[PDB]
Paper text:
TAs require pyridoxal phosphate (PLP) as a coenzyme and catalyse the transfer of an amino group from an amino donor to a carbonyl acceptor, thus generating new amines and carbonyls, often with high stereoselectivity. In this current study, a TA gene (VbTA) identified from the genome of Virgibacillus sp. 21D was codon optimised and expressed in E. coli, however, the protein was entirely found in inclusion bodies under all conditions studied. To address this problem, we successfully adopted a protein engineering approach, based on the mutation of a single residue (T16F) that resulted in sufficiently soluble expression of recombinant VbTA T16F in Escherichia coli. Transaminases are additionally divided into six classes depending on common structural features and sequence similarity; VbTA, according to its sequence, belongs to fold type I and the class III subgroup.
In order to investigate the structural bases that govern the improved solubility of the heterologously expressed T16F mutant, the 3D structure of VbTA T16F was solved at 2 Å resolution by X-ray crystallography. Electron density was evident for residues 2 to 444 with no gaps. One molecule of PLP was bound at the active site, although it does not form a covalent aldimine bond with the catalytic lysine residue (K273), as seen in the crystal structures of many other PLP-dependent enzymes. In agreement with the majority of class III TAs, VbTA T16F forms a dimer, generated between VbTA T16F chain A and its symmetry-related monomer (180° rotation). Dimerisation covers an interaction surface area of 5463 A2, involving 103 residues from each monomer and 48 hydrogen bonds (as calculated using PDBsum). F16 is located in a critical position, at the center of the 14-residue loop, connecting α1 to α2 of subdomain 2. This loop clasps between α11 (domain 1) and α12 (domain 2) of the opposing monomer, locking the dimer together. F16 has a clear role in stabilising the dimer interface, making 26 contacts (<4 Å) with main- and side- chain atoms from six residues in the opposing monomer, including three hydrogen bonds with the carbonyl oxygen atoms of L303 (3.4 Å) and H305 (2.97 Å), and the nitrogen atom of the α-amine group of S84 (2.84 Å). Such interactions result in the stabilisation of a second loop (residues 298–313) that contributes to the active site. The correct positioning of this loop is essential as it houses the highly conserved residue T308 that binds PLP via two hydrogen bonds between the phosphate oxygen atom (O2P) of PLP and the main chain amide nitrogen atom (length 2.78 Å) and side chain hydroxyl atom (length 2.64 Å) of T308.
Numbering used by the authors:
A (entry chain A), B (entry chain A): 2 to 444
């Protein structure tokens, strides 16, 4: 009660309705986490159905991660990486990331989050073309329904228009093309080609894509989509940036999302699950040719970086986090439990009247709600079906998040990679019960 | 030796010359820190003369900060603050920050760093005017020689042109006016007025200033400067944003830098010393009227925020960090040891031939080098005097940083707030010996 009033007075939340906060107070005040579970201050326990924010990949309560952070903080919590200063944790983490990326992605620039990483990637690809002598190759192409963060550049690279309306556009040379959502590869790829030709490939620096569009509703591309993308980018001399902020570190049943489509990007950004959210960290990995151009032509000080780039404690936590993912076979577990969740939720679809698509790639998936799945009739937006299911799930002990941009009704699912079959079974049953409740309240 | 080669191959550093890295390897590889000291992998020990990056304010090796992080990471390392979800650490930290800011600055938006904070502040002031019905009040005014970070907006708000040349300008509605460096208050304030009138106050959202320009060379404004600034901002209906990223949390001998000038900003950003760099954290504090406008007119979800906004572990570390600053009287110690360092370095000035200005406000200060201090003749830039002093300091066991933008030669000084008088004495003597060595090599 005191915590609720203090929150209202003093804490302006990210991605929260301030008017809701003032009227109702915090929806929930979390206190403790353990494995896939979170407990609030009233003692009620929940399954953390999207891993908090698609990031607590190894689960809550990891004594080993706490110990790895405490050991480095006693030893040397922070040291500068500026002016070529370095330290062993960042070096070892960079070497480790290079050992687990796609072939040729061996050089890492560190940050503290996903927005920082994507803003850095925009600046790095523009820097790359400028030192190449092509200062006109400047524009960033990205997808509708994409989400790339909300620092000033990534706010406009983000393809969901709600994010532009908070402050307006601050960036300039950005272009949004059609997504593969409910589209063929040829349609999506031709939209990219048409925009490239309207703009002229000599003005374009890079194409950014999430392997699986996360905030857009877990949009999983056709099997040939990124093969084409990679061929188009090659043909026009455009850099392909893969945004692995959600899909990285085992989330889709591969170490990185893009491996599902057998394509190597020029650049990759990451954050979130690299530390299972225990410590803010992100970064940008670049290909060998790009690193070589940097070495040859990036003269003097590289005028970009963050105080906390390469933070030794972040790096110590990330190293232990990656070792856990390897030792517990969490990449493989993510693929098998994603299959198990998809199989179960398909059965649930057949028990209900209002479930449309059910899709997963590893432990990254989604359940669409529709007035008539067989004809693909959606609910009108004013019924707010997916948010109602979120609320019913919440009351039944499951935290999920919904996506309704542009008249969709999508329940997102992405539990921690440690989840087991017993737990998948209960999660599926609760999802059934919550959709059934809303299905019933709708007459 | 293996660490040096791995660093070259895999780690692209912030604000480092990649070509230097490839040719010479990391200048230093740090291993351990304790209090004001750092030790590298060869066993050589250094005084951390700028607190690593103006941020390790309570010193290295704090077992209490390690323990505070480990306790929260075992309990609940991360939980979302989106959708009005909350948790006790962020609530308590927000309440704590509100207890120590200038009067009326009671509501906090959290981030993970200084660039994130300033990009958020740009977006928040633009949001504020848009919901006020003035979508044209958009432009951000800032100072030459300022540094506000290098996310996409803060890259252009930053007033030092080197930062623009890495990727070019990405932002649009920015304006740079003359700094108070070697200037009168009336000159600096009239430059601000002239630009406001050329642009028209109806197009201007905000004026950003560091209380003390840090990366610009520790530029300390005249005593009346911010009084005038605050009157000009009031007169034109412009928001005054104080960038406390360096000057916050005791650095200048006050809790916040702006208190030295008896002025309350509309908005304040912070990072760095809030956790003494033990855990990435930053934020934006807004005045009561602004919070009230948000409450009344910021409809629906606030479409801004970072995954790690309000990170529970960051907040637990920051709380203990602030309690240390209070219990060890570090704000007062910073003022007294700044006075002691200024007094000592003035004596050193009189023993040497090439020291110009010596200035401090608390433990934030600078020592200028000049060919002829009495007539104010500078060294030509091609002599690189200040960087040579940096190197000589380094070899004598002191890490400082230099500022040479626009033909200056400035040694920056900002040791952790725990430094004691014995330590100030040794630091002063080493500074004397290093400037004397370069003074001598220059014939
Ligand atoms: C795909 C993607 N990229 C970037 C971001 C931004 O990351 P952060 O919130 O750490 O700045 C997000 C956050 O959800 C994301 O989902
Ligand atoms: C005054 C000021 N503002 C902002 C920043 C950027 O902070 P960060 O490096 O955490 O993004 C800096 C960093 O030195 C700074 O000195
Ligand atoms: Cl392990
Ligand atoms: Cl204490």
């Amino acid at each position: 009660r005191s915590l609720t009033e203090l929150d209202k007075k003093h804490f302006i939340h990210p991605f929260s309705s301030i008017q809701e906060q003032q009227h109702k107070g915090a929806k929930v005040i979390m206190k403790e986490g353990d494995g896939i579970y979170l407990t609030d201050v009233t003692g009620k326990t929940y399954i953390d159905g999207v891993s908090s924010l698609w990031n607590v990949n190894v689960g809550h309560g990891r004594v080993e991660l706490a110990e790895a952070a405490a050991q480095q903080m006693k030893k040397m919590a922070f040291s500068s990486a500026f002016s070529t200063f370095s330290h062993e944790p960042a070096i070892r983490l960079a070497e480790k990331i290079a050992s687990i990326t796609p072939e040729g992605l061996n050089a890492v620039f560190f940050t503290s989050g996903g927005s920082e990483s994507n803003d850095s990637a925009v600046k790095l690809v523009r820097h790359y073309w400028k030192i190449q002598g092509k200062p006109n190759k400047r524009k960033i192409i990205s997808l509708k329904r994409s989400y790339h963060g909300v620092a000033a550049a990534s706010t406009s690279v983000t393809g969901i228009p709600e994010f532009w309306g908070m402050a307006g556009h601050m960036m300039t040379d950005f272009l949004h093309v059609d997504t593969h959502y409910n589209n063929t590869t040829e349609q999506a790829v031709q939209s990219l080609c048409q925009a490239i030709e309207e703009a002229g490939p000599e003005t374009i620096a890079a194409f950014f894509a999430e392997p699986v569009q996360g905030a857009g509703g877990v949009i999983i591309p056709p099997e040939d989509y990124f093969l084409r993308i990679r061929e188009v980018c090659n043909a026009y001399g455009i850099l392909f940036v893969a945004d692995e902020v959600i899909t990285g570190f085992g989330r889709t049943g591969k170490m990185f999302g893009i491996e599902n489509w057998d394509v190597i990007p020029d650049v990759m950004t990451f954050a979130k699950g690299v530390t299972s959210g225990y410590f803010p960290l992100g970064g940008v990995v670049v290909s060998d040719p790009i690193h070589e151009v940097l070495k040859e032509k990036s003269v003097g000080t590289l005028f970009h970086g963050f105080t906390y780039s390469g933070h030794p404690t972040a790096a110590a936590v990330a190293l232990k986090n990656i070792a856990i993912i390897k030792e517990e076979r969490l990449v493989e577990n993510s693929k098998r439990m994603g299959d198990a969740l998809l199989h179960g939720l398909k059965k649930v679809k057949n028990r209900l009247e209002i479930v449309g698509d059910v899709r997963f790639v590893g432990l990254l998936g989604a359940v669409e709600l529709m007035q008539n799945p067989a004809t693909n009739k959606p609910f009108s937006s004013n019924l707010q079906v997916a948010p109602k299911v979120i609320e019913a799930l919440h009351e039944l002990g499951v935290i999920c998040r919904s996506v309704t941009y542009d008249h969709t009704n999508i329940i997102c699912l992405a539990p921690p990679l440690i989840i087991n079959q017993k737990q998948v079974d209960k999660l599926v049953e609760v999802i059934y019960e919550a959709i059934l409740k809303v299905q019933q309240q709708l007459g």
